[PDB]
């Protein structure tokens, strides 16, 4: 099953995504076959820096809502503490 | 620029999803090209049918916030008043 | 019947919050008795003055989403275009 | 500091939020004082019973994020993995 993961950092918190930045594609590198898009939300303006980045959205394959769960839990970005909201929905191309 | 969009049904209203269907795809067609990603959120279950459909997620691309408020504001799913929530992220990919 | 309204203040737009305060105040005004509680949501550290506000949120009784809808539709911050994301659901006092 | 606090539950999980239930009022009871405002989110209709819960809000009072983090993990219904979207705001009285 395809499932969206829509994941918004805390404010103010812009430095602890930059310093889990490098753990966080180590974590998702051995998982890529598994994700179909992804990349970060954006905040104000039309800069596409690391410094414009201000929360994380992907489309994951997973076999269950525990999988999912399991990803989302062993997230680097998660165990620092990074996001205000999470999101997470069961999904298909149209 | 790219968007995420992402709008999730109003409960008991899956049948005005499906009334209005027709028309909401008819009102994408001539905006395809811009619509990198698009399909509808799922709920309980393993089922892909339209009775198992909850809410609509795109990514897109627009000049602007104005753009996709038209875009937005415009869909017939809108005017219907299909959805308790909308959620809207600049965007980029990793 | 109670509805939460929660409403997130696009990137960059603290300025059209304040712009369109007064107006937003003045459209509540007449409504206050329908308004069980309600209040700006703040962004970080522990300021609580006007730049810190991010989006509003409102508990509110209404007799159908109908009246939700045009509520929500004819505020001051909606037609502004303040807002990146809406969320509605019907609720209860535990 | 106040935060609102907003999760809402997976679909087809309404059993585990029943099943949980006196557990999570356990959980609750003794943090009281610090819950401003609380209920479950609810669905379609007009019904205001069990089965038409759909998640849950709280405006807590906390003197940190560590605390609402804290709050969050420890609740019955997150262990018992009830919740597709979590979402916290800091937040204050108009």
Do not use: C
């Not at 430095?15 to 954006?42: F, M, W």
């Not at 394959?61 to 990803?71: G, I, K, L, T």
């Amino acid at each position: 099953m395809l499932f969206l993961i829509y994941r918004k950092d805390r404010p103010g918190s812009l430095q602890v995504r930059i310093d889990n930045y490098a753990a966080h594609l180590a974590y998702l590198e051995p998982l890529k076959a598994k994700i179909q898009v992804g990349g970060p939300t954006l905040g104000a303006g039309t800069g596409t820096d690391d410094k414009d980045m201000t929360g994380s959205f992907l489309i994951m394959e997973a076999e269950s809502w525990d999988e999912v769960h399991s990803f989302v839990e062993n997230d680097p970005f998660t165990k620092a503490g990074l996001f205000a909201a999470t999101i997470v929905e069961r999904w298909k191309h149209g």
